Each structure stands twice: as C-alpha cells, then as structure tokens.
Design a binder for these strands. Structure first.
Length: 49
RNA sequence: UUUUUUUUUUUUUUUUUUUUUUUUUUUUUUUUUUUUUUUUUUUUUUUUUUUUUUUUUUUUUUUUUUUUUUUUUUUUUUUUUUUU
C-alpha cells in the first residue's frame, strides 16, 4: 500500500531497529561462519557450527 | 541518508574493358595346310579250446570341571553495550 510521511519515517527507523540486541549472534554468523578461513575446520569448532 | 559524469560537430554519385579470324573424308591386314584305335597284371596256400587264485581269526561301557562375592545421584557456564 501507499506509505505516508509518518509511515515512511517509521519504516526508515525500523531499518535501524531490526536485529537489535543480537550483535553477538549476527556478528558470529557474518564473520566466523562466512568469510571462510582455513582456521574454521579445526575440530574445536564443529560443535559450535 | 546524500554529495561524479551522462546532446551534437567526419565521410558517404560517376569516369576501364567486354563481336569474329585454326583445324576437322579416305588410303593396312583379315580362308585352309599337325596329331588323335589296341597290345601289362588281376583265384587259393598262417594261426585261431582249456590248465592260477578267490571263507574266517583285531579292537570297540564309564571315571574332570561346571552358584555367588566390583562399581553404578548431584555440585561449571549460559541478557545487552559497534556501524548501518
């Protein structure tokens, strides 16, 4: 549907609001899991994976 | 969050050549001449029964062992702090 000025501002703010308070998990995903490093498969990370 | 750039400027008709000139009948050879019946051998002559052996004599029950003896709850950690 069409978005008014208030709704557009609210959605733009919610862009920042999303995934708040969970920086540890998403940082773990993005950095440790993605960006595949030869040090990942090291037999002390399999349970964490 | 965002901070640049993002019209155009040339060329682009044509000019040659492009009929033909030779040759292109024929001339040999092309019947036949030998040989072509037959003459040996071609029955048979040994051997060809048989002569051993062929029952049996051992052994053949059994003698062990065969319950059990431990251990077997628990004692950590486990929200969040950036940017966008």
């Amino acid at each position: 549907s069409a978005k008014g000025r208030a709704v557009e501002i609210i959605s733009d703010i919610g862009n920042y609001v999303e995934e708040t308070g969970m920086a540890g998990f998403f940082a773990t995903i993005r950095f440790g899991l993605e960006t595949r490093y030869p040090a990942l498969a090291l037999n002390e990370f399999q349970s964490d994976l």
